[PDB]
Ligand binder design. Structure first.
Ligand code: D3T
Ligand code: MG
Ligand code: MG
Ligand code: MG
Lengths: 105, 698
DNA sequence: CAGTGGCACTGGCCGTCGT
DNA sequence: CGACGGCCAGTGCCAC
């Protein structure tokens, strides 16, 4: 149920998605990124309806992250109407993510 | 004989004040200090030694002290002071001849820790005096609360400076006696600290006389400098910078940027097993920060109200990997390698450290399916070359533009006997590695150095350049040494038309240059593959060529054997080296000096390169001497000026075409004189060219 | 088993020094 | 805390 983004589809799928979109900037070679991956799969379901979960692999899509000053991964950006509503970096836990989401949704 | 040294307020280029001097006279066995107001007395003491037919010893005086005194004498006392060349001795020159297998800091210009091998102690001391003096001066100030500035330790005279001046002479005196004790250069029956200058030069090994004349002449060349076209090089810099920008633009469009981990401190461990995973990027586990902030009231601290959100950005215990955004850098062999393997390139050759080799050779051979990237390879090659030019001409620490002096010339430094074989070394900047006219941008680079860029002090008319180069020098040296094996056969054949052009044809090589790098690589022991690479083929073509030229003149084998027989007793490889048992580990140079041999294999190269080096050294010396005896004056206020000496070629500035014609003819006379002087078995020759700059004169 | 040299640029590493 | 510089191996290419 997660959306796999690309540099060319990021503008319309995120910035013009109209609704809350949680973007996870990751890389196959990051320990923390592999940790939070399963958490995201479950979050995608539970929050289905009030939240869309999308992922952007910074290796395959090197053009988007820079625009957002990515300094560490995994980076979790919560977009709402083309605007970054909230940002959080680190492999949060299922609970911590839910906490972060419910507080910004 | 006296030993001296001075302390002044700056390097030669801008020195304007004599601070102090010290003189140790062997006849009185005493030291005498001269303070700033004793300058005239100091000078008188030096001239008294000259008038007595005596000798004056300095450590690096040929390049500094002697010329410095001439300058200071004119500025401060409006006095003409010119110590004669034959009355001076330089322990640095002596030390570089006797301990030629060793390196030195070039008087503190080079960091000792960066040099290979060992360093002579006394010389090390003298070379570090300025640094140690500055350290002393600096702490003393900070002990007084006062701050330290740029290099104020040289602005004024003080007693610490005096003490150091004294130390230099005692150390220089010890160094001198250490060098004089070498029986190979100085006959034991003579006490060289108690003889007139004529005896000193005549009784010591020829090499001692040659080295001092070379140093004295080359110091002068440094002072002359090489007229440089600053304007033309700045315009070249602009053009190159633009080309670099465009290449970067295109390359960065082809090869995108990426993220790399950077800044990680902690080790990433398996969340289940807890096993450390060293191969995974280092991470960072923030110890502070949560989803919300701390509660600031009732029903917040009691979980009733919302509770302020933590805008921070991190969460305690939530690990992440710190990364940096990297932009493709055409100058980074690491980046080139990354992007090309990501394009399907499969590296064949790697360095003896794992990294894949990324030189022009492999780049030229690389193949990838994406035509755009395949094309990017040429852009990368061009970019790398553009950088070398930019670095050497404008951006490098030793860039020509950073070295142009006010007199519009570059005063490159020369270590007269810096190479083990007796060759000179050049630096600051290295005027012996200017791109050749046939390489990219070579003509512009070369033409920027030239007599034309110097306008006569009186007429304002540009000077003319006389370039002279010894003809196939090292091959003629080979002919000489193997004449005892082939009765001068090669020595006669080599004169039948240009030797390199002849070889080029016989070898079927594209250029005369290629022929040169071929014949020398061959003559000096290059392997079959190494030869193949040189001509552009493989180990196969290598063997054919090597056997064809060795067949032609088998005496090469004979010469190689006698050298071996003479030097080696036995040898063997242990692991990554060949341990050798020597009979003698040095060759007797043409002027009698010991020439240290690094390996049995490079021996022939030591013999021939040294011979060519000493021939050329005596050559530039005799050439200037023959010109002076012809009434010509050496200097910009004269008729000619040495601008550069590059192994077997000299570039001389001349006030007129007529003088240039005489410089060229005299150079040829001097070379033949040198050949006769050492009973050379091969006729020696030079080729000269008159022109405005280096592009036309070489 | 080419040899002699100088020197530029990248990327590591670490201590001084301003945010 | 992190930008930045002197020191350093690695690598390469320039000249002869
Ligand atoms: C280029 C080169 C040169 N050498 C040595 C041995 C020769 C001297 C002088 O070189 P030069 O080009 O003048 O050669 P030279 O024979 O004097 O040719 P000219 O007649 O001056 O052109 O340097 C070497 O060992 N390896 C090389 O690749
Ligand atoms: Mg001195
Ligand atoms: Mg030559
Ligand atoms: Mg030459």
């Amino acid at each position: 149920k997660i959306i796999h983004l690309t540099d060319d589809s990021f503008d319309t799928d995120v910035l013009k998605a109209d609704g809350a979109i949680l973007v996870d900037f990751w890389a196959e070679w990051c320990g923390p990124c592999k940790m939070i991956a399963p958490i995201l799969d479950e979050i995608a379901d539970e929050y289905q309806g009030k939240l869309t979960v999308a992922k952007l692999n910074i290796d395959q899509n090197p053009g988007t992250a820079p625009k957002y000053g990515i300094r560490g991964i995994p980076t979790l950006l919560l977009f709402k109407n083309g605007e970054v509503a909230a940002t959080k970096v680190g492999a949060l836990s299922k609970g911590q993510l839910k906490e972060f989401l419910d507080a910004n949704l | 004989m006296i030993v001296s040294d001075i302390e002044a307020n700056a390097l030669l280029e801008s020195v304007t004040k004599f601070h102090c001097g010290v003189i140790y006279d062997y006849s009185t066995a005493e030291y005498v200090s001269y303070r700033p107001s004793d300058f005239g007395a100091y000078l008188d003491a030096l001239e008294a030694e000259v008038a007595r037919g005596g000798l004056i010893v300095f450590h690096n005086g040929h390049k500094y002290d002697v010329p410095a005194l001439t300058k200071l004498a004119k500025l401060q006392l409006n006095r003409e002071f010119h110590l004669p060349r034959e009355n001076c001795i330089d322990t640095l020159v002596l030390s570089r001849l006797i301990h030629s297998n060793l390196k030195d800091t070039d008087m503190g210009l080079l960091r000792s820790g960066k040099l290979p091998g060992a360093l002579e102690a006394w010389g090390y001391r003298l070379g570090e005096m300025k640094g140690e003096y500055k350290d002393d001066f600096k702490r003393m100030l900070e002990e007084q609360g006062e701050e330290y500035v740029d290099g104020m330790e040289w602005w004024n005279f003080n007693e610490e400076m005096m003490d150091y001046n004294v130390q230099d002479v005692v150390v220089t005196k010890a160094l001198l006696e250490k060098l004089l004790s070498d029986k190979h250069y100085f006959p034991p029956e003579i006490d060289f600290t108690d003889v007139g200058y004529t005896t000193f030069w005549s009784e010591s090994l020829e090499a001692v006389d040659i080295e001092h004349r070379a140093a004295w002449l080359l110091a002068k060349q440094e002072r002359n400098g090489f007229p440089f076209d600053t304007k033309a090089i700045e315009e070249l810099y602009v053009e190159l910078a633009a080309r670099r920008s465009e290449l970067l633009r295109k390359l960065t469009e082809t090869f995108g940027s990426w993220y790399q981990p950077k800044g990680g401190t902690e080790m990433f461990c398996h969340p289940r097993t807890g096993k450390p995973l060293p191969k995974y990027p280092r991470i960072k586990t923030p110890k502070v920060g949560g989803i919300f902030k701390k509660p600031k009231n009732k029903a917040q601290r009691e979980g009733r109200e919302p509770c302020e959100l933590d805008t921070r950005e991190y969460v305690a215990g939530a690990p992440y990997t710190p990364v940096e955004h990297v932009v493709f850098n055409p100058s980074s062999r690491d980046h080139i390698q990354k992007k090309l393997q990501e394009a399907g390139w499969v590296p064949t050759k790697y360095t003896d450290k794992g990294a894949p080799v990324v030189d022009d050779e492999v780049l030229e051979g690389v193949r990838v399916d994406d035509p755009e990237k395949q094309a990017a390879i040429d852009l990368i090659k061009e970019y790398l070359m553009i950088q070398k030019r930019i670095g050497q001409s404008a951006e490098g620490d030793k860039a020509w533009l950073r070295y142009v002096a006010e007199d519009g010339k570059i005063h490159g430094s020369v270590n007269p006997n810096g190479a083990v074989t007796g060759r000179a070394t050049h630096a600051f900047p290295n005027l012996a590695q200017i791109p050749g006219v046939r390489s990219p941008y070579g003509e512009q680079c070369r033409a920027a150095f030239g007599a034309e860029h110097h306008l006569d002090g009186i007429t304002g008319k540009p000077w003319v350049q006389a370039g002279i180069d010894a003809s196939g020098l090292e091959l003629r040296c080979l002919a000489h040494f193997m004449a005892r094996f082939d009765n001068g056969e090669y020595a006669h054949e080599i004169l039948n038309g240009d030797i390199h052009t002849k070889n080029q044809i016989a070898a079927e090589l594209p250029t005369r240059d290629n022929a040169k790098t071929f014949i020398y690589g061959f003559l000096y022991g290059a392997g079959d593959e190494k030869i193949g690479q040189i001509v552009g083929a493989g180990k196969e073509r290598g063997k054919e060529l090597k056997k064809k030229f060795l067949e032609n003149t088998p005496a090469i084998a004979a010469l190689r054997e006698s050298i071996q027989q003479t030097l080696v007793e036995s040898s063997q490889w242990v692991a990554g080296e060949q341990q050798v048992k020597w009979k003698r580990r040095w060759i007797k140079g043409l002027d009698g000096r010991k020439v240290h041999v690094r390996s049995p294999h490079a021996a022939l190269n030591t013999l021939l390169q040294s011979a060519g080096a000493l021939i050329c050294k005596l050559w530039i010396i005799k050439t200037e001497e023959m010109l002076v005896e012809k009434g010509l004056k050496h200097g910009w206020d004269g008729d000619f000026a040495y601008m550069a000496w590059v192994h077997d070629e000299i570039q001389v500035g001349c006030r007129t075409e007529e003088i240039a014609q005489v410089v060229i003819e005299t150079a040829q006379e001097a070379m033949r004189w040198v050949g006769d002087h050492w009973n050379f078995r091969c006729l020696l020759d030079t080729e000269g060219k008159m022109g405005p700059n280096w592009a036309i004169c070489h």
